[PDB]
Amino acid sequence: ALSSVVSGTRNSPSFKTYLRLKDGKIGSFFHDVPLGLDKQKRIANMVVEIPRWVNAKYEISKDFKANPIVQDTKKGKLRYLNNIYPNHGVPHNYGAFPQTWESPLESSSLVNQNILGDNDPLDVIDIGRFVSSTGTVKPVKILGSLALVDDGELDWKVVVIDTNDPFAAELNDIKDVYEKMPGVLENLKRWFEVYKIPTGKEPNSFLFDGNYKDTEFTLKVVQECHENWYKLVMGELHGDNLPSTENATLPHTKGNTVFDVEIEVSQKAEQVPPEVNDMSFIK
Amino acid sequence: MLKLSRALSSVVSGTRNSPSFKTYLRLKDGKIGSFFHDVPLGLDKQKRIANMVVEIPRWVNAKYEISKDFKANPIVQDTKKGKLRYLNNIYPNHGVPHNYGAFPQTWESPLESSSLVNQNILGDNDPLDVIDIGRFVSSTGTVKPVKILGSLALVDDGELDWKVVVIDTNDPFAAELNDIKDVYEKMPGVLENLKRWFEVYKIPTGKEPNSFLFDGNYKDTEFTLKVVQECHENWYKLVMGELHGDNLPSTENATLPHTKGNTVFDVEIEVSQKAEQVPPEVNDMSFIK
Ligand SMILES: [Mg+2]
Ligand SMILES: [Mg+2]
Ligand SMILES: [Mg+2]
Ligand SMILES: [Mg+2]
Structure with missing residues (x-):
């Protein structure tokens, strides 16, 4: 089975999580984890970036070799999401x-409006009971979606x-969450609207x-986004600033490679800055 | 780092997330005291401050409380049928x-019924409950000054x-809050969330919702x-042996010189092992309509 390996020090700029493939070789979280989309069973594989109740803004890196999961940074400073009270x-x-x-x-056939894609893998929110570690790959049941608009x-x-x-069998469409998991859709909607307000940003808005x-x-x-990815890795798109398509597993692709990365020994995990625990109380 | 003056502190006994875990009050000379009896309330009516004993840090589930039954009133995790008790995640x-x-x-x-409620209704037999809404996350057994802002009259099991x-x-925000309305206006959602939490938090354990006075x-x-x-006055009558009843709390204490319960505590500090795992079900979420 796929697994992951930590490199470097937790809560420091050195921290990384890499995909480990079945033979022990390093793969890409972006390119080498099969989506495994089953349209019939409405399931696909998620890569977990941020465990529930964690603040560190971990993401699949498009820039680092083999697309490890790394904590976002700004002005050289590690980025933590706020506590939206x-x-x-x-x-x-x-x-x-x-x-x-x-x-x-490629502007989406699914929106009537000429609006831009966000240049990243589709974002996934797993509302299940389990807290999952960074770098977990697991099957998830697709329920619905929210058309957030953030910076155009x-x-x-x-x-x-x-x-x-056990509750997954009880949920077969997005209204099941509204009825059986009261407050979850409302809270996620409000979170995505306001979560950047404490950093000096305006509220986000929505389509539909x-x-x-x-x-x-x-x-x-x-x-659609799985097909866009496909065109990207097959070199079948013309465009500037396309992500890297380096990959360990995709035969005949231009980016196909063997990843040679350093797994740095992990030190005494640094303290999270105390201000990460402050709450944001948004009107 | 270095304190030049003696201060109250605490000592952990036993293993975190195990039935052995205890936090004891350490008095200025280092001996064990009671968190119930031996921490001066320090109530200042003019500055609207008093000392809180912290039991549960923000974002902790373990239902730590001052034990009325354990010798020297350590903070211990509530336990039932030998099962440690965790508060639910009220989504x-x-x-x-x-x-x-x-x-x-x-x-x-x-x-007694309080003379301050227009209603006959008995108290809950424990120290007054305190909720510190400030930015700091405080460790179990912390004694610290807090500014009193307001209260909620919860009714639970009558x-x-x-x-x-x-x-x-x-x-630093404490100076901007002088009464319970400043929380409602300057810390939007805090009073709402607390009131809903106190209404519903035992529903997942099979209890009906709580109600309120006022x-x-x-x-x-x-x-x-x-x-x-009033609660400080009643504590005082209790330790002074002025009350009659079949299940009054213990008044054993190290510091109260004129009380029957005044004693020297001899407690064992057990060696702490690596913290046990919290059971994964403690992370489940409760979705209450
Ligand atoms: Mg996105
Ligand atoms: Mg993303
Ligand atoms: Mg109480
Ligand atoms: Mg209490």
Whole structure:
């Protein structure tokens, strides 16, 4: 089975999580984890970036070799998400669909409006009961989606649940969450609207009037972004500033390679800065 | 780093996330005291401050409390049928939303009805509950000054369970809060969340929701000081042996020179092993309509 390995020191700029492939070789979280999309069973594989109730802004890096998960930084400073009261850190496990990409050139057939893709793998929110570690790859059941608009880009949020959650069989479309998990859709919607306000940013807004899109519509977003990724790795797109497509597993692709990376020994994990625990109370 | 003056502190006994875990009060000379009896409440009516004993740090689930039954009144995790008790995650809260604790040298008498409520309703037999809404996360067994802001008259299993809202006096925002309305206006969602939390938090354990006096309104600072005074007065009668009842708390104490319970504690500090794992079900979320 796929697994992961930590490099460097937790809560320092050296921290990384790499994908380990089945033979022990290093792969890319972006390119080498099969999405494993099953349109019939409405399941696909998520890469977990941020465990529920964690603040560190871990993401799959498009820049570092082999696309490890690294903590975001600004002005050289590690970035922590705020506590949007009464949330502690992220309210659910946050991650991505591997082998997907929101092209900032191919404008979506699914929105009537000429709006940009956000240039990253599709964002995934796992609302299940399990707290999942950074670098976990697991099957999730696709439920619905939220069309967040952040800085002119369509930042889709796809709501899923871990297929190991006994409750997953009780949820077969996005209205099931509203009825059976009271408060989850409302809280995620408000979180994504306001989470940058404490950093000096304006509230985000929504397409579709702020309404969640159902499973059938969401599956089309996933398929489209999986096809965009496909075109990207096959060299079948013309465009500047395309992500790296270096990969360990995709035969005949230009980026196909063997990854040679240094796994740095982990030191005494640094303290999180105490100000990370401050709460943000948003009107 | 280095304190030139003696201060109260605490000592952990046993293993975290195990039935052995205990935090004891250490008095200025290093001996063991009671968190219930031996921490001066320090109530200052004019500055609207008093000392809190912190039981549960913000975003912790473990239901730590001052034990009325254990010798020297350590803070211990509530346990039932030999099973450690954890508070639920009342979505979207993670554990307790703020630092939770108590006012030492206070007690809600279960004998008397308060003269401050227009209603016959008995107290909950424990120190007054305190909720510190400040930015700092405080460790179990911390004693610190807090500014009293207001209170909520929760009713739980028929008993009046006062919740006192306070802020750590070191919080730079403390100066901007002078009464319970400043929290409502300047810390949007805090009072709302606490009130809903106290209404629903035992529903996952199979209890009906709690109710309130004063129609679920918060009481202001002036009224709250009267509740704290009255509970401090009743604590005093308890330790002075002036009350009759079959299940009064123990009044054993190290520091109160004129009390029957005044004693020297001899407690064992057990070696701490590596903290046990919290059971993974403690991370499940409760979604209450
Ligand atoms: Mg992302
Ligand atoms: Mg996105
Ligand atoms: Mg209490
Ligand atoms: Mg109480």
